[PDB]
Every structure is written in structure tokens, then in C-alpha cells.
Amino acid sequence: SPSSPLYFEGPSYGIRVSVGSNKQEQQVVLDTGSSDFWVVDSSASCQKGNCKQYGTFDPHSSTSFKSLGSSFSIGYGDKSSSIGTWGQDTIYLGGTSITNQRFADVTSTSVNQGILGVGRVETESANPPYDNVPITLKKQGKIKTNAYSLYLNSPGAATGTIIFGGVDNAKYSGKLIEEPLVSDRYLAVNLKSLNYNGDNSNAGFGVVVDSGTTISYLPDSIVDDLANKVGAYLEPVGLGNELYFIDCNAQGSASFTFDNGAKITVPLSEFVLQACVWGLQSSDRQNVPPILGDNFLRHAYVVFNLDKETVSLAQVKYTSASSVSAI
């Protein structure tokens, strides 16, 4: 199965991939919450500091690049956005390559690096839809099933892993528990309940299982009481946003129960992020769908099956042992 290391950057995990005849190196966010692959053009205008520390792409020096001429724009949940023009080229990832893959060459962005969106075609910022990277990996015979497994690995590990088309059965406990999707567009599953260090709360709503989000965002119906219980407090992050902070010097775990008996336990240290922000935030206040992000996902082994339209979950097992099978 093709597979890639995932490099912890702090807010995100990067995947390395090269583009074009001259194999121009990029490190881009591995994002299960979006569906388009895009790179930072060498001549782009970054809106916020240096968005060119994780590679750039110069279309003019790849003899295999072709612009498609159509414009690309996308907005993300954190209000960052990108503008560019679609093109196609050869892409190297996972120890393999795909030819004539559509991706955007971005000429202005407020994101800090490019993004490899590996989500469903329904969240592509395109009309008509097109074959994004997971679809092409299957179509070109690199994998038999449009599916991938995510192992962000422990806090402090340097590198996690994504396996395209395969599953490492050594890296979880119990059985993978398959969940159907509950969104028309996202890789989202039902969250049944949340027991945060003994304060238990009904949920019963969908959550996007999102590698491209740093922390986790849930409705006020859950978060309000927890903020009171844990001492989380709103402060301006300013201007006119605010987030919950928490004392950096604040035992136990938070358990997330899904359908079909799946339960993921997350140590409470995952909820103090260096001033420290709380690792729970409000999806209502931040104007995003509910999301379980990296602080959750480090504690799960997750199989995203885009053919079957399922997400399967099990408690992660941190181990060098490996037993990979095709999904």
C-alpha cells in the first residue's frame, strides 16, 4: 500500500509531495476536512507572513504542467482562504506517482502552506466535480479501494502515518467499529455522548473527523457547562474574535462515544494547548460544523472509506509493530 509519514508542525500534520517534471518539493496539510489539493505558487501573495516555508511551485519550470484556465477559490472554517487557477501535472506521494492530476496553483492565500484535501468529492470547491487525489490513486491502480488509514501517533512522536488503501492492524486495540456518514458532504459520524472527566453529556449530532483541524469544536449545549467545570474562559484573540483559554497549569480523560459501541478515550492533557487555549472550542461561536480534530485523532486509529462512505474507529495502539493489509 502507498504510505506516507506525517510531520507534526504544531497546528497541522504535513505530508510531503513533489510536483512536476522537476519534482518540486512541497509539504502540505493532510486534510480530511477538504477535498482539493493546492500548492503555493512561487509568486503568490501570502496575506499573513511567510506562507512559503513549506515549499513553493513554479509552474513555468515543469514541462508536464498544463493550466486548466479555470479559477479556484475556497474558504476554510478558520476564515482563511485561497485564490488561484486550476492546473494538472504529475504528483509524487506515498512512494508512488499519479499523472495528469488536477490541483490548484494558488496565487493568494491566508493559509500558511498548501493543502492536500483527501475528502469526498462533495466538498470539492469545483463545479463540475473532478477526480481528486484519492480517486486518482484508485483509478490509476495504486490502490484497489478509495480508502485510507490515519495514525497521527502519540503526542511527541515526530511523525504519524497515512496508508492509502491499507490498514495497519497492529495499531489499534479491540476491533475497528464501522460508522456510516451522517453528512451530505463531510466525513462526519454521529457523536452519541461525551464524558469529560466524569461530567457526562448527551450529544447526538454529527462531527467532522478532521485531520486538518488542530483542536475540537462542539456545540455550546455541551461546551458551556464544561467551560464552567474546567475553568475555561473567553478572551479576545482579537479583533472581534475570542477563544476559550485555560490555565497552562491545569488528570483523567475524556471519552467520546459514537454509534455501535465505539468509544475513544483522550487524555485530558490534550485539552491544554500552548497563555494556553482550551482544546475544546464552540462550533456555534466559531461558525463551523462540529469537528473532532488532531487532539482527538492522536488517540484513534481511523479508516476513512470513501467508496463505502464509512469511517471506522478504534482506540489507537502506539507501537512499532506493523501488520498492513489492503482495506
Binding site: 497541522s12 486534510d31 480530511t32 482539493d36 475556497i74 476554510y76 483541524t213 487555549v277
Partner: peptide, 6 residues
């Protein structure tokens, strides 16, 4: 942090 598509 970041929160990745609408």
C-alpha cells in the same frame, strides 16, 4: 490553531 472547508 487552524480549521480546514466550508
Amino acid at each position: 490553531x487552524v480549521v480546514x472547508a466550508x
